[PDB]
């Protein structure tokens, strides 16, 4: 199963120019393109090895789509400021995320088209792709307008066909890097916190995609509410990391195992100290 | 590739 997603961010900065617009595009957890209106010569640019091959028409067409989009977001931002009765002096943020999730057959499982204003839900296209969820009374203004113009029907074309077709192209380009999971390497560390307790930390490193489960067990049952987890974090070279830690009685470290669940594993690893 | 599709909120 796979997905392609575009993420758009416009940020107003009154008195210091026109809004900044940045976009990034992802296939699953791999970023492959960017656009930043504040660059020297703003244009779409490659960010993964397998997209570089694309010709100048690719880059030109997309670059023109982003510049056009950015200009409409300047008007949307002014509209939004008005709906919420806000001042002209404040910086505000409009974010947008859209794209397609496909299953094993390669056809659409789920379409996405959603928006936030100042970091909170504004409006989202529902999974039937025929109706919207407005977040508050301001957003119902947009909803009424978009219902009247038949926005959802118009959006379905890209989300069902074109989105899906590009995703397939890109899976072809990327091959292993995109289609074969890179399993978690691992380690277990141990650190006494006193003469009667220690920390055991389970480490999961250089993995891809980001989805993973790390679980501490004692004698078999999970150690649910006494585990510290850190957010999954990017390694900096397209892989991910996580750790989970539990504090245990000294001399009992033998009772504890760390179960690691990731798509790149033939079977759930079981680690010990 | 991004969509060729334009709107106002």
């Amino acid at each position, epitope marked *: 199963s796979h997905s392609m997603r575009y993420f758009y961010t416009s940020v107003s900065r009154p008195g210091r120019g026109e809004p900044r617009f940045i976009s990034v595009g992802y296939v699953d957890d791999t970023q492959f393109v960017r656009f930043d209106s504040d660059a020297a010569s703003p244009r779409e640019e490659p960010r993964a090895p397998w997209i570089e091959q694309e010709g100048p028409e690719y880059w030109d067409r997309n670059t*023109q*789509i982003y510049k*056009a989009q950015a*200009q*409409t977001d*300047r*008007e949307s931002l002014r509209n939004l400021r008005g709906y919420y009765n806000q001042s002209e002096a404040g910086s505000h943020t409009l974010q947008s995320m859209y794209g397609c999730d496909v299953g094993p057959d390669g056809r659409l499982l789920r379409g996405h088209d959603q928006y936030a204003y100042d970091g909170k839900d504004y409006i989202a296209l529902n999974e039937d792709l025929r109706s919207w969820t407005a977040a508050d009374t301001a957003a119902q203004i947009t909803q009424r307008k978009w219902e009247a113009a038949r926005e959802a029907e*118009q959006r379905r*074309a890209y989300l069902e*066909g*074109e989105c899906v077709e590009w995703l397939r192209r890109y899976l072809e380009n990327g091959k292993d890097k995109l289609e074969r999971a890179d399993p978690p390497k691992t380690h277990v560390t141990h650190h006494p916190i006193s003469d009667h307790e220690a920390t055991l930390r389970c480490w999961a490193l250089g993995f891809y995609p980001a989805e993973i489960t790390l679980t501490w067990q004692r004698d078999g049952e999970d150690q649910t509410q006494d585990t510290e987890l850190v957010e999954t974090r990017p390694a900096g070279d397209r892989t991910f990391q996580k750790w989970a830690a539990v504090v245990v009685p000294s001399g009992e470290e033998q009772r504890y195992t760390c179960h690691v669940q990731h798509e790149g594993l033939p079977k759930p690893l079981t680690l010990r100290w | 590739s991004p969509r*060729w*599709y*334009f*709107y*106002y909120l």
Partner: T-cell receptor
Amino acid sequence: PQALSIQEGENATMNCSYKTSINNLQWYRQNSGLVHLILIRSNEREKHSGRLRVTLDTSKKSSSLLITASRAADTASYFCATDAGPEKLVFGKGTKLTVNP
Amino acid sequence: MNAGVTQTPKFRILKIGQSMTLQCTQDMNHNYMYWYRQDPGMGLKLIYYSVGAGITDKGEVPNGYNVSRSTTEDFPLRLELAAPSQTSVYFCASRQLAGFYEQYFGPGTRLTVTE
């Protein structure tokens, strides 16, 4: 210059072509200020509204417009426009249609 | 009274070397405006366009002309030094948005340049 003469009541078909890859094609009419008639998107093969039916074939880079049961006020020149980037249209050569009584 | 694009003047004669301003106004609150010229029996050619107040850019045949867009409602076209090649019908148009939107046209200004 392309020209087409018919009798009121008959159907009229007109064609246009274009040169680049596109996202949409719009037919317009002009007689007497252009007025738009119908828009078709590059994912669509046929669309209709009232007496008009438009078709599009992106392999051939061509579109046809069919007016069912032509009337005197259909007499006009008919043109196509296609996108040239998100913000601009490029317009082609018309077809002059004359609907005779 | 309807919404639409209006233009003045309807008709103009200019001597070679004279200058002129064609006015275009619309009341549909459209951000995107366009100027075209059309020789009789021929197609439209884009001169300049504007995506919003304070923004203009060149079309296919910009030479000989300039525009400005200080408000949303108006898009004036300036003819700087008339030459015989500028005899034509000049059409202003507007639309609501980029992408899948049709344009609305003004009635046209018919210009004859004469020695």
